[PDB]
Design a protein around this ligand. Structure first.
Ligand SMILES: Nc1nc2c(ncn2[C@@H]2O[C@H](COP(=O)(O)OP(=O)(O)OP(=O)(O)O)[C@@H](O)[C@H]2O)c(=O)[nH]1
Ligand SMILES: Nc1nc2c(ncn2[C@@H]2O[C@H](COP(=O)(O)OP(=O)(O)OP(=O)(O)O)[C@@H](O)[C@H]2O)c(=O)[nH]1
Ligand SMILES: Nc1nc2c(ncn2[C@@H]2O[C@H](COP(=O)(O)OP(=O)(O)OP(=O)(O)O)[C@@H](O)[C@H]2O)c(=O)[nH]1
Ligand SMILES: Cc1ccc(S(=O)(=O)Nc2cc(C(=O)NCc3ccc(C)nc3)ccc2C)cc1
Ligand SMILES: Cc1ccc(S(=O)(=O)Nc2cc(C(=O)NCc3ccc(C)nc3)ccc2C)cc1
Ligand SMILES: Nc1nc2c(ncn2[C@@H]2O[C@H](COP(=O)(O)OP(=O)(O)O)[C@@H](O)[C@H]2O)c(=O)[nH]1
Ligand SMILES: [Mg+2]
Ligand SMILES: [Mg+2]
Ligand SMILES: [Mg+2]
Ligand SMILES: [Mg+2]
Ligand SMILES: [Mg+2]
Ligand SMILES: [Mg+2]
Lengths: 420, 123, 415, 419, 433
């Protein structure tokens, strides 16, 4: 069962390319595109992300999208550039200039039809399409505006299939662009309704890990993208490896439709770690890709994935330990809400690793942060004519703000919920 | 004190009498009673055959009640399974209809946003 | 002057041919059927011809018919020693008996078989230039001996109102008996045949049992031991030959035609010794109290070296009462030839013997016991369903009971 | 005079197979069907239970009935399995599921006709048929359910014929199904009306006899069956051997059954083992020798038939029986004079030299039906397991009618106990 | 004749089905060829093993089974298994997408896509049967396919085959080896619907078999195959009385009649003794069957009354050894029976010795027994399930996944209400008269 990947905007294509390079090495596929791995577990579930082509060579089922045509050459310039098939590059005349309306309603709408054409041709060649994942940021205008428009369009064409997103949230520590709260609030307004799971990749987190932990004076985007790639690899592990699908994880992780925003975590960040080390470190706020202290909220559901050669008896023992040892941080009204998976194949370089996916109400901290920044500008209607000039009304901003405030409200109500 | 009358003397033996102190049926009624007994037996046979026939009818009734229960069970299974299947289809397609109607409504709003951009471009 | 014998049921058949073999030995008739003493080959008017017809080949044939609704007993005659003495037609059998059930043998199975037995009986009678009447041998308790004998009796009367019918009936005894329903069968069969029998010689099997064990010194007698003993008392009684003499000399009133026979002596003694022995209760055929009862008749039949004076002396020696309208006396008969017996049989051949035939009120004692046992079960209607299930009216149980009560009452009346 | 034998269900076919084996051995018949005995008395009344095959051999007048093929396959595989006529096997394959309703109404209907066709054919092969005997249990589904149905059907077809059953009564000590009280009560309701006599063989008594007074170990089904086979050989002695002078089903039924419904007998054997005439008579009347779990001292015999086998003094058996009667005078009904009668057959069973059997029509057997009634009531009060019967077209009025009839019988036996 | 069709539904049903049939092939000596050198009747014959196997012309013995899963990875393994050549390729039916742990998908959305195909093949199997006994349905309680499709199948089987015997072998959810969080939903839902269409449901709880494998086989973390191999022995004991000529037997109808005191009370638990690692007595294994530790469901029998016990023995065991052991058990004051069941035991014996897969952790033994007991104590397992259901339904958690597939919240409400009645019914049948 196949998955179609789409990467939109600068950031989306950046972390999308790094992700492909990661899993292609994990599956043993060179830039040429031919399988040169040593085992069989690297092909058995490879159809999920790759399409077999003539010459015994696999090509990523990926579609690259941006209104700025230069990012296309950047991806093809980067390593594993020729592995993507040229007909899946859909590029516009020039970028959206961080204007969400340009990507969602005007310029992005011009390019969206050809994008849906590439999506259609890839989806019809699938035996049974699982769904789509989209990598993008929420601060700019392409992945933010056009991304939401894409996932909304793809929903009309495929109402019953899964839509996952890897959304990168803005942080003043990373970018000085001022209207990013506007774009993030508008796209989140779209994400709350149009996606089944969204992995909130906080640039504030990524910056904090590289600086306060990895000890990097001035970290470049390439430093942060290494984190995103390792999480994305670790999150998609069981999808791409046999033994250990989309709808099931969504059914088990999402107890309520709007609360489908997950705080990711990886361990280790960069002497193989121990299962108790990995287990503890994995539930630590210093190892979360969202700037949210999970001790400030409660876990609704938790899915763990361990990688490498280890005794699953110990994995169980430790996972139960951290659960009871921190009982209060798990809702009592969702029994067996923490599940665990183990795959023998470890990531590149690491012998021991673990990835954490948590539907936690502490993620409201992230959305609150956006809401405050959004409110500070909207109250003085700062820079709104840039969006109004494209045809948008002020009430759409008001709807996005209130809907996001509802989302953090909901998260807090269930945080305070009692078994009776 | 023992007077005897000498009688029937012969070669085979003698005989005598000593003294001591001195001094309609109808066949047709027989056949009527035998036929009456036979008729009474016949009446008893009939009552048994009657009693047995009532028992055979009860066996038929029991078997018929078994058949009726099995058939109603089938019919009630068939009709309840159909009913909830059709309801489930109405519900699932109503959700997807509303979802696509809300989704097409966004599409219209986007076209209005474009039209308003065009109107403002005439400035 | 010939007489016809009929044996109904197992008891009737078995004590029947026991009598016939004693007859053949009495008259020196051989198992081949031949009789070297008979010089008129092919008929005659001798005395033994009252019981044996003669054929052209000279075979002496009993004037008898054996009827039982089941074969196991009649085939004993068909395959026995005197088998050739009987034509194959003389013996009649069904395959289903009456199950110790009077009503089954009378009203149910008796219908299907009475007409055949009648035709065969008349074919016997057509061989009789002079037929004095009938002797029937049957049991009281047995199903066919009770029910079919009754049916045959009433039919015999209507078809032969001319002749007379005498009975040789077996009284049920608790010591020797086979069915608990025997009082039922007895009461019913008497009431239906009392009017149709002119005389009726009963015999208590317990009495025969007792005198067998005691007088002959045997620990437990076989049915054949009995049969031979009864056969001697029947032999002496039938050895008289008029069926009219018996009906009138021993029975003064028709309903009380139940005399008791006493045979003596039973050794394995003088003329007076054996005559007094018959006045003793321990030698009589029905356990009975002739002490209290008053006699009404008393035929005395001797066999052997007995002359009149020996008898007259013996009677004078002995003190029993009589009914006050009957001549107090004793008819006496003599048959000089000594009594014959089975060669090697359990009783020895003796010089002289006597059989006393007495009609006394005492025999009412036997009736009362049987009546009381009847009353016990009928009071609870026990076993009555078997008879009613055969078409018999429950009322018949009463008609036969109240009549039975009258019999004893009429007996006590002449006390 | 000939009898047709029928065996129905697991228990009925197992005890029936062992009964035929025991009496085939007594009559000198080997598994091939040909005679090889040392006495011509083994053939005088052999037709009663056998037919002359053309090949110098004899075939039992036996019909084998079951709704499941297994039992039949087992008895065909037994030592005497070759003796039975092959077309006399009537089996279904749906089974009865331990359910009286399936055996009497739904499943048993699909098989009872072709059973009758065999019952008819073997009756056309009889010069004079006395009646039928059926071996079956009362606790299961086939023997209980189809057996009663069968019994009623042959009565409709042969109303003038004697019907006897040898019926095993259920007991928790040896159980096949949990609904035995239902099946037993339901079928007793039928035996009170469509049989002339039933010999109540109680699995409670059999167990107790094999355990306590026999070996003090645990008994196998062969042990229990050994008790009932020998008992059956005893009850049938005078039918299969000459000299009885009164050996027909009808005679015994008229002598032993004073009232139509009180036709349930307590059988008894002596000795019990895997002797003196006094012991033979005395033990015969002991409750430790009763194949029904009832104490005779709790009631009064109405009528009693004793059969002695082996060479012995006839006067000894006579007086012995007379004095055990007069020693316990009050434990016999007085309003039935001379209610115990005996019979001797000098041919004893194979295995012993002198034995003795007992057939008692006593009121004490109410204790048996009482045990059933209580267990039945313990279930019916809670309507437990009842849905398996009503789901077959049965109503609850039939269950209540059945138990009320069995209680009426208990009262009736007790009533004549007080007279 | 007397054939039984097995239907294996979902991952748990299929993997347990292939475990049972491998064990069957080992017992009767059927090779992976489909050939059986101990059968003389080619292509036909009515031997006892034919109840579960059909015979084809070339000598191949084909199982009277149907494997259905809405997704092929588990079933494909059967197609690629060592026993592939035993099944006609159509006997294995597989969709393209599973029910995704969602009862609504298995019963409605995805189930209707192959239900008719499944029912068609079941009719052809039934067409190959001269005297159909009933059906054995193997499934889980908490999967989408195991709960949703099984319930749709059972409903359809009742329409097509009437009240013909339908029996279940169900795996009860166990947090230890539980794999989905909506499992209390799926379990409550399927129980509600299959309640009216099932005659009897033999229950096992995967944690109990787990603890048993841990304690008795010294396996630190037992594998799913381990669990499955034990269940195969339990199933084999239940079916040995129908695949083997035996002195004492218990057929599908006998199972129903003796183990189900009332229509709704048809959930007897399983128990099996003995479980011995590779590296005895008759009364010992019977006594073990009543010890609470060795119960295939997390249930304390001492917290309830026994309503019925079915003891099925196989091997060196004769009825006198059993009745003795049952006698010793009948004395035990620890084992209490309801006062409306005075005769409380049904027993089947098969002298054919047990058999294990060669090389497995289970040791070959000479005698074994499996007990199926209906006790009021099993209400506790219902209670623990319903409570988890309450914890999520009060907040309506996850309900939207079922509403999106056409289900109404009224279905959840009436399903739990019926489950609460089942709890109350299990309580009331224990009160003394
Ligand atoms: N972690 C990470 N964040 C990035 C990267 N590139 C851009 N971003 C973030 O993404 C946001 C800007 O969105 P972009 O992706 O540059 O914009 P776009 O989608 O190309 O749209 P336009 O440029 O407005 O047409 C800011 O918050 C950046 O910090 C990258 O490589 N890594
Ligand atoms: N003295 C004597 N009495 C016998 C003889 N046979 C039977 N009885 C008695 O006669 C009574 C039974 O009558 P049976 O002659 O046996 O019966 P049946 O007339 O053949 O009638 P069923 O056999 O019942 O159809 C019992 O009291 C027996 O003791 C016998 O040979 N001699
Ligand atoms: N004993 C046993 N239980 C199993 C096995 N596989 C799954 N289970 C149990 O079954 C339940 C989950 O149902 P599954 O069979 O995995 O799911 P399914 O029926 O395939 O349903 P979907 O895949 O969700 O459509 C859990 O309780 C598992 O523990 C197995 O091989 N053996
Ligand atoms: C609380 C809870 C209960 C049960 C589950 S689970 O059924 O889905 N099992 C499960 C799967 C994976 C896994 O990598 N799946 C593949 C996948 C699918 C979709 C996406 C976007 N990424 C990955 C990891 C851990 C678990 C424990 C999860 C959480
Ligand atoms: C109280 C009473 C008085 C008279 C009788 S009796 O007339 O029937 N004689 C009698 C026969 C047998 C006997 O075995 N018959 C064969 C037979 C018939 C039927 C059956 C099922 N089995 C066997 C035993 C004992 C006696 C004493 C019985 C009881
Ligand atoms: N004595 C004895 N009883 C048996 C035998 N087989 C079954 N039973 C009993 O019969 C009753 C069950 O009836 P059964 O014949 O098995 O059921 P059926 O097949 O439907 O007729 C229970 O009381 C069992 O104890 C046996 O061989 N001997
Ligand atoms: Mg850009
Ligand atoms: Mg006779
Ligand atoms: Mg002459
Ligand atoms: Mg599955
Ligand atoms: Mg074959
Ligand atoms: Mg059985």
């Amino acid at each position: 069962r196949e998955i179609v990947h789409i990467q939109a905007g600068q950031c989306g294509n950046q972390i999308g390319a790094k992700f492909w390079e990661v899993i292609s090495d994990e599956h043993g596929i060179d830039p040429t595109g031919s399988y040169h791995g040593d085992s069989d577990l690297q092909l058995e579930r490879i159809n999920v992300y790759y399409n077999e082509a003539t010459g015994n060579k696999y090509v990523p089922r990926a579609i690259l999208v941006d209104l700025e045509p230069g990012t296309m050459d950047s991806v093809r310039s980067g390593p594993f550039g020729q592995i993507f098939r040229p007909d899946n590059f859909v590029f516009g005349q020039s970028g959206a200039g961080n204007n969400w309306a340009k990507g969602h309603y005007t310029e992005g709408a011009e390019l969206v039809d050809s994008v849906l054409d590439v999506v259609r041709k890839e989806s019809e060649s699938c035996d049974c399409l699982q769904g789509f994942q989209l990598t993008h940021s929420l601060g700019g205008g392409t992945g933010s505006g056009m991304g939401t428009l894409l996932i909304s369009k793809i929903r009309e064409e495929y109402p019953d299939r899964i839509m996952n997103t890897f959304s990168v949230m803005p942080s003043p520590k990373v970018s000085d662009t001022v209207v990013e709260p506007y774009n993030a609030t508008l796209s989140v307004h779209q994400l709350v309704e149009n996606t089944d799971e969204t992995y909130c990749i906080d640039n504030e987190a990524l910056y904090d890990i590289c600086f306060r932990t990895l000890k990097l004076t001035t970290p470049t985007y390439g430093d942060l993208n290494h984190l995103v790639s390792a999480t994305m690899s670790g999150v998609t592990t069981c999808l791409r490896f046999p033994g250990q699908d989309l709808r099931k994880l969504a059914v088990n992780m999402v107890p309520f439709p709007r609360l489908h925003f997950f705080m990711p975590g990886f361990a280790p960040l960069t002497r193989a770690l121990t299962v108790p080390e990995l287990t503890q470190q994995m539930f630590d706020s210093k190892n979360m890709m969202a700037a949210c202290d999970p001790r400030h909220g409660r876990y609704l559901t938790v899915a763990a994935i361990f990688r490498g050669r280890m005794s699953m008896k110990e994995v169980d023992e430790q996972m139960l330990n951290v659960q009871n040892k921190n009982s209060s941080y798990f809702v009592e009204w969702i029994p067996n809400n923490v599940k665990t998976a183990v795959c023998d194949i470890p990531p590149r370089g690491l012998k021991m690793s673990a990835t954490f996916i948590g539907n936690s109400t502490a993620i409201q901290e992230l959305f609150k942060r956006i809401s405050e920044q959004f409110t500070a500008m909207f109250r003085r209607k700062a820079f709104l004519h840039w969006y109004t000039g494209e045809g948008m009304d002020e009430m759409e901003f008001t709807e996005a703000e209130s809907n996001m405030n509802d989302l953090v409200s909901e998260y807090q109500q269930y945080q305070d919920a009692t078994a009776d | 004190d023992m007077e005897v009358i000498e009688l029937n003397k012969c070669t085979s033996g003698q005989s005598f009498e000593v003294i001591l102190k001195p001094p309609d049926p109808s066949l047709e009624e027989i056949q009527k009673k035998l036929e009456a007994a036979e008729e009474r037996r016949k009446y008893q046979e009939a009552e048994l055959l009657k009693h047995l026939a009532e028992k055979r009818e009860h066996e038929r009734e029991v078997i018929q009640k078994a058949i009726e229960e099995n058939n109603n069970f089938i019919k009630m299974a068939k009709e309840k399974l159909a009913q909830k299947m059709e309801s489930n289809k109405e519900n699932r397609e109503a959700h997807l209809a509303a979802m696509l109607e809300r989704l097409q409504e966004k599409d219209k709003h986007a076209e209005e946003v474009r039209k308003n951009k065009e109107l403002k471009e005439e400035a | 002057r010939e007489c016809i014998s009929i044996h109904v049921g197992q008891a009737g058949v078995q004590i029947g041919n026991a009598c016939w073999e004693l007859y053949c030995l009495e008259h020196g008739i051989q198992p081949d059927g031949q009789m070297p003493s008979d010089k008129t080959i092919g008929g005659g008017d001798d005395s033994f011809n009252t019981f044996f017809s003669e054929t052209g080949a000279g075979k002496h044939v009993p004037r008898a018919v054996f009827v039982d609704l089941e074969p196991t007993v009649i085939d004993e005659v068909r395959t026995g020693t005197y088998r050739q003495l009987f034509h194959p037609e003389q013996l009649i059998t069904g395959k289903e008996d009456a199950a110790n059930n009077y009503a089954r043998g009378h009203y149910t199975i008796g219908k299907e078989i009475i007409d055949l037995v009648l035709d065969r009986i008349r074919k016997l009678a057509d061989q009789c230039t002079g037929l004095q009447g009938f002797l029937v041998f049957h049991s009281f308790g047995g199903g066919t001996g009770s029910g079919f004998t009754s049916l045959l009796m009433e039919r015999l009367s209507v078809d032969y109102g001319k002749k007379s019918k005498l009975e040789f009936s077996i009284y049920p005894a608790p010591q020797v008996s086979t069915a608990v329903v025997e009082p039922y069968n007895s009461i019913l069969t008497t009431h239906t045949t009392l009017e149709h029998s002119d005389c009726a010689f009963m015999v208590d099997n317990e009495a025969i049992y007792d005198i067998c064990r005691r007088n002959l010194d045997i620990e437990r007698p076989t049915y054949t031991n009995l049969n031979r003993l009864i056969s001697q008392i029947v032999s002496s009684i039938t050895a008289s030959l008029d069926l009219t003499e018996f009906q009138t000399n021993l029975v003064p009133y028709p309903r009380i035609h139940f005399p008791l026979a006493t045979y003596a002596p039973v050794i394995s003694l003088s003329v007076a010794e054996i005559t007094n022995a018959c006045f003793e209760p321990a030698n009589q055929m029905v356990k009975c109290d002739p002490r209290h009862g008053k006699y009404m008749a008393c035929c005395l039949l001797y066999r052997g070296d007995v002359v009149p004076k020996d008898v007259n002396a013996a009677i004078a020696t002995i003190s029993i009462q009589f009914v006050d309208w009957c001549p107090t006396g004793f008819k006496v008969g003599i048959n000089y030839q000594p009594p014959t017996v089975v060669p090697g049989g359990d009783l020895a051949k003796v010089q002289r013997a006597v059989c006393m035939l007495s009609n006394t009120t005492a025999i009412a004692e036997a009736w009362a016991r049987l009546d009381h046992k009847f009353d016990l079960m009928y009071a609870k209607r026990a076993f009555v369903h078997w008879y009613v299930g055969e078409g018999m009216e429950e009322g018949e149980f009463s008609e036969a009971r109240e009549d039975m009560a009258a019999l004893e009452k009429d007996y006590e009346e002449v006390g």
